[PDB]
Design a protein around this ligand. Structure first.
Ligand SMILES: Nc1ncnc2c1ncn2[C@@H]1O[C@H](COP(=O)(O)OP(=O)(O)O)[C@@H](O)[C@H]1O
Ligand SMILES: Nc1ncnc2c1ncn2[C@@H]1O[C@H](COP(=O)(O)OP(=O)(O)O)[C@@H](O)[C@H]1O
Ligand SMILES: [Mg+2]
Ligand SMILES: [Mg+2]
Lengths: 233, 233
């Protein structure tokens, strides 16, 4: 059986591999807002590949194995932590409701937030003690955050050289058969906030969230600035 | 000028001392539910004194200096951290909305949660990174939690020998002139969950929160079980 999530489908290959297929569907505000954008899947697939390859070069262990053409990646099957790990460099989104700081406030150092993946409870934020009750040891949490913080440096530096501010982003992790902590899911304009360095405008899912313009146009601009090429689809 | 909070008034004495006066007012659900209970102030004052004295004996630094008769304590003036520090031994209250665990679930080890004191944002939970942005260093946070966890052991052990389960409780802290971290505010049936060991019933502000019975009767039962004496008022 294939798992069909809000944005991607996961097709089993064997015991240790999956196909991650990116859909054109977009959801927001915990699923209340919905639309489909032709080519969104392709862009998010291609961009994930570029980011995973960049991170692998820097010695980040990711689930990325290869491409299966189109909107499909081949990825290592992992035993997933029930976490969303959010790294924040610039104040935006939900952080404005947690710290009395304005949108665009540049953080002196990165913030890491842990969210417990649980639909029933609406993905509440947790700390290290909650994580322990969930079966995640302090060492594991520490290794996870150390990876997220390294990922942050690499992506923000890379993107800055392209005139893009990495505002924040969301990661997921799992364990491989050796018990190593492996970066999973996706890295795309769906799961990151990207702002133009010159204009400060959103080139990410916030365009869809708040009707700030044309989503495909914004995701394309990201692809074009990153690759140097115009997207083929 | 005197500071008048929801439950207590703080009267300045000199440069380094305050009077903490406990009122009969009770509030719940971030101030939406209100009532007054005659003698509540007295009970919460007396009980805070007993707890602060118990903790001082165990080498916990608290703001407790002495009594000024009635509902008034003399306390050291501190430069307060903008935090509420919650220690949890048994699942109850807001934790049920954060972990899919039932009320009464006994935790394998204590949970410490940090809340940023901010009316505008409704006291959101924060982690160590948020605390840093707020000007609280990691060392400070670590010392705070180490104290809270020690306080927990002492109170839970003490209360268990009296047939009372310490379910959770909320602490506040500030810095003294030497830059030491000093336990502040109050320790009472207002700020702790106390359950009868035999019956599991609430002997705390939850009685008022959820109309579980007579608040004064419940606070009295706590006083009587702790002191061995019937409250004089
Ligand atoms: N390497 C992996 N192994 C197993 N599961 C993964 C891996 N990477 C991502 N996942 C999970 O696969 C699903 C990806 O599809 P998605 O549309 O994002 O689903 P959802 O809407 O549940 O987040 C998610 O449940 C995600 O946690
Ligand atoms: N030692 C102390 N020094 C300075 N302020 C304190 C001390 N202990 C408690 N406080 C503060 O004094 C007030 C106590 O009264 P309270 O009725 O609880 O007010 P509030 O409704 O604002 O919590 C709180 O603002 C508390 O943080
Ligand atoms: Mg997802
Ligand atoms: Mg108070």
């Amino acid at each position: 059986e294939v798992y069909e999530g809000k944005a991607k489908k996961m097709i089993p290959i064997d015991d240790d591999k999956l196909i991650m297929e990116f859909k054109d569907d977009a959801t927001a505000f915990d699923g209340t807002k919905k639309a489909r954008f032709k080519g969104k899947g392709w862009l998010n697939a291609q961009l994930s590949v570029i980011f995973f390859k960049l991170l692998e070069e820097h010695g980040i262990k990711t689930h990325f194995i290869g491409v299966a053409g189109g909107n499909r990646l081949i990825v290592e099957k992992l035993d997933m932590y029930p976490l969303e790990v959010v790294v924040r460099n610039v104040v935006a989104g939900s952080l404005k409701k947690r710290l009395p700081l304005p949108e665009g406030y540049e953080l002196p150092e990165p913030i890491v937030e842990l969210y417990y993946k649980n639909d029933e409870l609406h993905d509440p934020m947790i700390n290290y003690y909650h994580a322990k009750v969930l079966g995640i040891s302090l060492d594991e949490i520490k290794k996870i955050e150390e990876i997220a913080l390294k990922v942050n440096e690499i992506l923000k530096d890379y993107l800055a050289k392209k005139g893009i501010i990495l505002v924040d982003f969301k990661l997921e992790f799992g364990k491989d058969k050796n018990g190593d902590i492996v970066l999973a899911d996706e890295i795309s304009p769906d799961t990151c906030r990207f702002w133009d360095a010159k204009t400060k405008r959103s080139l990410d899912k916030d365009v869809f969230r708040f009707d700030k313009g044309d989503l495909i146009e914004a995701y394309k601009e990201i692809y074009e600035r990153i690759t140097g090429e115009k997207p083929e689809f």
